[PDB]
């Protein structure tokens, strides 16, 4: 189905920070030596509140816990990162047979 | 520093084929993107063309047949010959960097990112 | 493909410019913005749409989206005052016609 956010509150907007400075690709600025620190790699961004999708989406990242809590639990590797790699080729496992 | 030196202001001919070069000091040719860009006085900008030491040359589509591009990478220099010139012609000739990155599926120009000062190129009898 | 920019744009001093450079599905391509103050080389002022490099203050702001792209300037001086260019990338690349920014009052 969809899912109907039901927090307390939902802060609507998402000012977000993710990875890259994406005009980091001029200069010498991708040159590891030249460069941003370990804290200028980031980018800025705003979204907003269109259609339940922000408060949609907090209330997924809460419905999705328990599961990936104990997809962890029976993971034995200290750190994991193959998750969406893995959803990927379930993906494709899906459409190439049952 | 990445400096960018065109040739030399003054004289074309009508009907003859003009002749610029772009001398690159301070840094290696090989990373860059390299641009030509004119602006005839009291005009715009107009692309002509851009250039990777590895790659083939690509041309606007109205000055395709007119024009080419080339690099010496051991004498760090861009050239552009552009034919059969008229008075249309006559503008300040702008050397231009334009660096490299991956995005949207390929390595692309991001952005013309470094100019020269331009060479004034007036055609005339 | 065509990129539609204002001739003209005015401001009065220490408030914001706003040039808008237009398109058919712009919002699909990246949009540089470059100024050109008289007698001098142009200069890149935006790339990737509103990506600023070293030497760009602040108070310059590039967007775009859908058919629209905009250059935003806060706190304007006359030393501002200059021949501003839209430009992107079709099958080839275009620029805008260029706007003149003229510092009012």
């Known amino acids: 189905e969809a899912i109907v956010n039901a927090q307390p509150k939902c802060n609507p907007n998402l000012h977000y920070w993710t990875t890259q400075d994406e005009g980091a690709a001029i200069g010498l600025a991708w040159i590891p030596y030249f460069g941003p620190a370990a804290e200028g790699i980031y980018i800025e961004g705003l979204m907003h509140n269109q259609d339940g999708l922000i408060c949609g989406l907090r209330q997924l990242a809460n419905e999705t816990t328990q599961a990936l809590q104990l997809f962890l639990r029976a993971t034995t590797e200290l750190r994991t990162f193959s998750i969406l790699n893995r959803k990927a080729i379930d993906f494709l496992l899906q459409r190439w047979g049952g | 520093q990445v400096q960018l030196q065109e040739s030399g202001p003054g004289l074309v001919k009508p009907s003859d084929t003009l002749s610029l070069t772009c001398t690159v000091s301070?840094?290696?040719?090989?990373?860059?993107?390299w641009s030509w860009i004119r602006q005839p006085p009291g005009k715009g900008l107009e692309w002509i063309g851009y250039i990777y030491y590895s790659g083939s040359p690509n041309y606007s589509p109205s000055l395709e047949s007119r024009v080419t591009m080339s690099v010496d990478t051991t004498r760090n220099q861009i050239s552009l010959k552009l034919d059969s010139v008229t008075a249309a012609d006559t503008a300040v000739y702008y050397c231009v960097r334009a660096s490299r990155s991956y995005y949207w599926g390929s390595y692309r120009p991001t952005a013309f990112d470094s100019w020269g000062q331009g060479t004034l190129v007036t055609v005339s009898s | 493909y065509e990129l539609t920019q204002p001739l003209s744009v005015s401001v009065s001093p220490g408030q914001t410019a706003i040039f808008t450079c237009s398109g058919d599905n712009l919002g699909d391509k990246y949009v540089c913005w470059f100024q050109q103050r008289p007698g001098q080389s142009p200069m890149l002022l935006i790339y990737?749409?509103?990506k600023r490099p070293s030497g760009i203050p602040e108070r310059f702001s590039g967007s775009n989206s859908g058919n629209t792209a905009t250059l935003t300037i806060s706190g304007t001086q006359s030393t501002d005052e200059a021949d501003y260019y839209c430009q992107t990338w079709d099958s080839t690349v275009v620029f805008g016609g260029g706007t003149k920014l003229t510092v009012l009052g």
């Open positions: 301070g840094g290696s040719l090989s990373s860059f993107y």
């Open positions: 990737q749409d509103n």
